[PDB]
Amino acid sequence: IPSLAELETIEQAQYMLTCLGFCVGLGNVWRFPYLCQSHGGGAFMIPFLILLVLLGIPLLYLEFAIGQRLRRGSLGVWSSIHPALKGIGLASMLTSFMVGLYYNTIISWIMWYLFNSFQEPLPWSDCPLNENQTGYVDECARSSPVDYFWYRETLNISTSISDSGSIQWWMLLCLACAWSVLYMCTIRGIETTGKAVYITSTLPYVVLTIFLIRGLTLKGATNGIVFLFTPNVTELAQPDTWLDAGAQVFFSFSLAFGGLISFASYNSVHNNCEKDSVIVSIINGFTSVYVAIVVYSVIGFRATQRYDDCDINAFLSEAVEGTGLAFIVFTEAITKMPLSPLWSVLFFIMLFCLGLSSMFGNMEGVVVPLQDLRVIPPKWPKEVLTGLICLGTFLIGLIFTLNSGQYWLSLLDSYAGSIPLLIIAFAEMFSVVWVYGVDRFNKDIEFMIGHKPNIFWQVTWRVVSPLLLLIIFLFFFVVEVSQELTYSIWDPGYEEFPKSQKISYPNWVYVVVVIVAGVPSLTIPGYAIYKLIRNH
Ligand SMILES: *[C@@H]1O[C@H](CO)[C@@H](O[C@@H]2O[C@H](CO)[C@@H](O)[C@H](O)[C@H]2NC(C)=O)[C@H](O)[C@H]1NC(C)=O
Numbered sequence: 001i002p003s004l005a006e007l008e009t010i011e012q013a014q015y016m017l018t019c020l021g022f023c024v025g026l027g028n029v030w031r032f033p034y035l036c037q038s039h040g041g042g043a044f045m046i047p048f049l050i051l052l053v054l055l056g057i058p059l060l061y062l063e064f065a066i067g068q069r070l071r072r073g074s075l076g077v078w079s080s081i082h083p084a085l086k087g088i089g090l091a092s093m094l095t096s097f098m099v100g101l102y103y104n105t106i107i108s109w110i111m112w113y114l115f116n117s118f119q120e121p122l123p124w125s126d127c128p129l130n131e132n133q134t135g136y137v138d139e140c141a142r143s144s145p146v147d148y149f150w151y152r153e154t155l156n157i158s159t160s161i162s163d164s165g166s167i168q169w170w171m172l173l174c175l176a177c178a179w180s181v182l183y184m185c186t187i188r189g190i191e192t193t194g195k196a197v198y199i200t201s202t203l204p205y206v207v208l209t210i211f212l213i214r215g216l217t218l219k220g221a222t223n224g225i226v227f228l229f230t231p232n233v234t235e236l237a238q239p240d241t242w243l244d245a246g247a248q249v250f251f252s253f254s255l256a257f258g259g260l261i262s263f264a265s266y267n268s269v270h271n272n273c274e275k276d277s278v279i280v281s282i283i284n285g286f287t288s289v290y291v292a293i294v295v296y297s298v299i300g301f302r303a304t305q306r307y308d309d310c311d312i313n314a315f316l317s318e319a320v321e322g323t324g325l326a327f328i329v330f331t332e333a334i335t336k337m338p339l340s341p342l343w344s345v346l347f348f349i350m351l352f353c354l355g356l357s358s359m360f361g362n363m364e365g366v367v368v369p370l371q372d373l374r375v376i377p378p379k380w381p382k383e384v385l386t387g388l389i390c391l392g393t394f395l396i397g398l399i400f401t402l403n404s405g406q407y408w409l410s411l412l413d414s415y416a417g418s419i420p421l422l423i424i425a426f427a428e429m430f431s432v433v434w435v436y437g438v439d440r441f442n443k444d445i446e447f448m449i450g451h452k453p454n455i456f457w458q459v460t461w462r463v464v465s466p467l468l469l470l471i472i473f474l475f476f477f478v479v480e481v482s483q484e485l486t487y488s489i490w491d492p493g494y495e496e497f498p499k500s501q502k503i504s505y506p507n508w509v510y511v512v513v514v515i516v517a518g519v520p521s522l523t524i525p526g527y528a529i530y531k532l533i534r535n536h
Pocket of ligand 1: 232234235
């Protein structure tokens with residue numbers, strides 16, 4: 001590590017749009033709303049806000065500050081503190097790959113909808129007629145046409161994770177475009193993104209505002225809004241609610257991934273990373289709540305319309321459930337708009353840009369570290385590494401093109417983007433407070449900011465944050481052993497078809513969990529041992 005001296009000598013609007021790039025993403029617009037409805041609004045929102053202040057901000061500040069200090073990427077930072085801690089960056093890289101795997105699938109879906117958004121009568125605006133034009137399609141009439149276009153016309157979802165059917169070639173063609181668009185950006189887009197984020201980070205708020213204006217003017221919006229902030233104590237006492245809220249914060253802030261550390265690694269040795277952390281954290285949080293208010297306003301409308309056809313509570317709880325919640329909700333909203341096609345295009349364009357940028361940043365979190373690992377003949381240009389990475393991920397991504405793809409994505413998302421992040425977070429915190437030393441840390445921050453971190457930072461970094469990730473971790477093991485795995489299925493032929501049918505995951509589903517959530521979590525401890533033993 002350089003001496004503080006070595007730094008000061010090696011030293012010799014924008015602020016806000018770079019900051020914006022960190023507050024928006026598919027994690028805040030696609031994942032957040034779906035996880036909320038999974039816990040009945042309030043019971044998720046409340047814990048999520050609590051943990052965004054006690055783990056979010058502290059960890060974010062602790063990331064920006066460590067990478068500003070060491071002037072090294074995530075894989076160099078940890079190895080520098082202590083050599084037996086390379087594992088952290090390695091686990092960071094694995095997690096990044098496992099998220100990019102299904103992040104592109106999301107982006108494939110986004111474009112698909114964009115492709116279908118150039119028709120005066122949008123294809124989800126109503127129900128399709130049977131072969132004899134005798135009535136509406138049954139599955140479509142019992143469910144919503146917006147449900148029908150997501151579940152049948154788009155995904156052609158099966159009824160189990162075991163029933164795979166074929167590969168949805170439409171999805172393939174989009175995913176091919178998504179990966180190709182990604183490869184093109186990785187080769188050149190990188191610099192362009194630095195010049196394009198100025199709109200990609202602003203457009204979201206613009207479009208969301210329009211959708212907020214319509215959402216709040218929809219009958220029943222309030223029913224939705226209040227449901228988002230009235231916690232069901234019983235659910236608020238579930239160890240899985242506090243486990244999911246925990247991971248959501250790390251996924252929204254992009255913490256426990258490595259990008260933020262590398263980003264700060266290129267900041268001035270005197271940049272105030274204490275303000276950056278706060279500003280970014282606040283906006284990122286507002287963004288998620290803002291998106292939830294938009295979505296829940298629409299959910300309220302839909303449910304209220306059914307409580308009218310016929311408590312609203314039950315209706316709201318059974319309005320929209322799953323990963324496609326965002327696609328279904330925002331599409332329903334679009335249908336209720338003048339010249340809908342224009343709005344559909346605007347929305348899918350901004351979502352595609354928000355996704356492309358989010359995915360590009362994630363790709364870096366896989367390629368950069370690999371390059372540093374020096375695991376390839378130097379000759380091989382970054383192109384080779386990137387193309388190879390893209391190709392490999394795309395190949396596995398075909399699992400989501402299957403008719404059971406949605407079931408797969410849900411499974412992976414529930415693990416690949418959860419426990420692993422929690423582990424990395426704790427590891428990082430501990431390594432900086434107990435290995436690197438909190439005292440040294442405080443002095444270094446006092447050298448670049450001028451003052452030592454307040455008591456808040458101290459208590460959070462030393463006790464509260466670590467303790468929280470310990471109890472939440474324990475929860476994970478009281479949930480994995482005290483709750484049989486179950487997933488909802490879309491079976492048109494089933495009593496209360498529109499209702500949810502939570503079936504049990506096959507036994508082979510555990511080998512999947514052990515791979516996605518296990519390898520990255522054990523990468524840190526494994527490497528440590530390797531080094532230690534090798535050290536003797
Ligand atoms: C409030 O939340 C609780 C907690 O999830 C809900 O209770 C669940 O009800 C379902 C349906 O019968 C059961 O399968 C679960 O086992 C229950 N979980 C627990 C821990 O109680 C409840 O339905 C929600 N509704 C209310 C009362 O607001």
